[PDB]
């Protein structure tokens, strides 16, 4: 992804300082992830995982863009959200159509069932406008999918 001047400075902090930085400026606001990187939902999620010391090199951060994060997140290899329990703070949350497991959105868990994201409409339309998944994904199917916008989706917690 492309970084801003501020996103570059923040990315080159030590692993320790990056965690402290995310906690103080981003996971609960008041900063907007768009002030750090110029990407879309997947890049916002990857940037936050990188700050929390995920297995992402600076070179991967500054060369992988948008959907190319999908083989790094490996969402379908993670834990399915059961629709009721808390999401682990700072983790990447992936949303896919059941049919073909086609991922269309990524968010960041910020506590309980709340998420921050960009470019996701009802699943997060701005980093500073958190969404409670329990308010949006209320109807759960026998397969563990949820009814969303006329179709069925899975919710996965990336291990990244």
Task: Give the single-character DSSP code of 65.
Answer: -
157 CB contacts (<8 Å, ≥6 apart)?
78, 79, 80, 81, 87, 88, 91, 92, 93, 109
The resolution of the experimental structure, rounded to one decimal in Å, is 1.8
Q: Which of 80, 46, 86 is nearest to 66 (CA)?
A: 46
Q: How was this structure determined?
A: X-ray
Which residue, among 47, 22, 23, has the nearest Cα to 106 in the 3D structure?
47
Residue 152 three-state SS: strand
How many Å apart are CA 129 and CA 42, to the nearest integer?
17
Please report, for the chain, the start and end positions of each structural domain, with discontinuous segments joined by +: 5-70, 71-157
Q: Which residues contact 124 (CB under 8 A, 6 or more apart)?
A: 41, 105, 107, 115, 116, 117, 118, 130, 131
């Amino acid at each position: 992804m492309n970084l801003t001047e501020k996103g570059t400075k923040t990315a080159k902090l030590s692993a320790s300082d990056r965690i402290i930085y995310a906690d103080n400026h981003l996971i609960h606001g008041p900063d907007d992830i768009t002030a750090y990187m110029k990407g879309v939902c997947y890049d916002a999620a990857a940037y936050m995982r990188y700050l929390y010391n995920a297995k992402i090199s600076f070179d991967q951060l500054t060369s992988i863009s948008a959907q190319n994060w999908l083989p790094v997140f490996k969402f379908a290899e993670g834990r399915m959200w059961d629709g009721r329990n808390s999401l682990p703070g700072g983790k990447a949350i992936g949303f896919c159509r059941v049919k073909g497991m086609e991922f269309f959105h990524a968010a960041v868990a910020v506590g309980g069932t709340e998420i921050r994201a960009i470019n996701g409409g009802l699943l997060g339309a701005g980093w500073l406008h958190p969404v409670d998944l329990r308010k949006v994904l209320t109807q759960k199917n026998p397969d563990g999918s949820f009814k969303y916008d006329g179709t069925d989706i899975f919710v996965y917690i990336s291990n990244l």
